[PDB]
Design a protein around this ligand. Structure first.
Ligand SMILES: OC[C@H]1O[C@H](O[C@H]2[C@@H](O)[C@H](O)[C@@H](CO)O[C@@H]2O)[C@@H](O)[C@@H](O)[C@@H]1O
Ligand code: CA
Ligand code: CA
Length: 125
């Protein structure tokens, strides 16, 4: 009753999803794509990664670009109260990168990528 819990969805290519497909999946089970709003949540997700041996994997988070006057937003509506972008990111590479992915290594860094790319994902509930 006092927290959301996180769950990794590491998938082979035949079951990977776009950002929107991943958001729809997490919402259909009663949650949303995961937001990382502070260092505590970052640590919780890193611990899940260490527990699963799911090392060096990339995962969709709930980061998505809104209108120009909103900038990057979290799908769950939470504030962008913490940022852990990789160096130079977000860079909107070739003008087509509007969704955020986690690099699931010890840096736990974020990168904007094309929303239609197939990826693993993380839900919260
Ligand atoms: O592929 C687009 C991506 O390319 C470059 O990033 C590289 C690396 O730093 C990333 O961690 C991995 C995983 O996304 O992708 C590339 O190998 C950068 O130009 C990056 O901004 C861009 O999104
Ligand atoms: Ca949160
Ligand atoms: Ca990028």
């Amino acid at each position: 009753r006092t927290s959301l819990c996180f769950k990794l969805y590491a998938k082979g290519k035949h079951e990977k999803k776009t950002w929107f497909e991943s958001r729809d999946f997490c919402r259909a089970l009663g949650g949303d794509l995961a937001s990382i709003n502070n260092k505590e949540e970052q640590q919780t997700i890193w611990r899940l990664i260490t527990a699963s041996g799911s090392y060096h994997k990339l995962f969709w988070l709930g980061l998505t670009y809104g209108s120009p006057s909103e900038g990057f937003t979290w799908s769950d509506g939470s504030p962008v109260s913490y940022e852990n972008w990789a160096y130079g990111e977000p860079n909107n590479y070739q003008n087509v990168e509007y969704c955020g992915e986690l690099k699931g290594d010890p840096t736990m860094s974020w990168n904007d990528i094309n929303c239609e790319h197939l990826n693993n994902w993380i839900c919260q509930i």
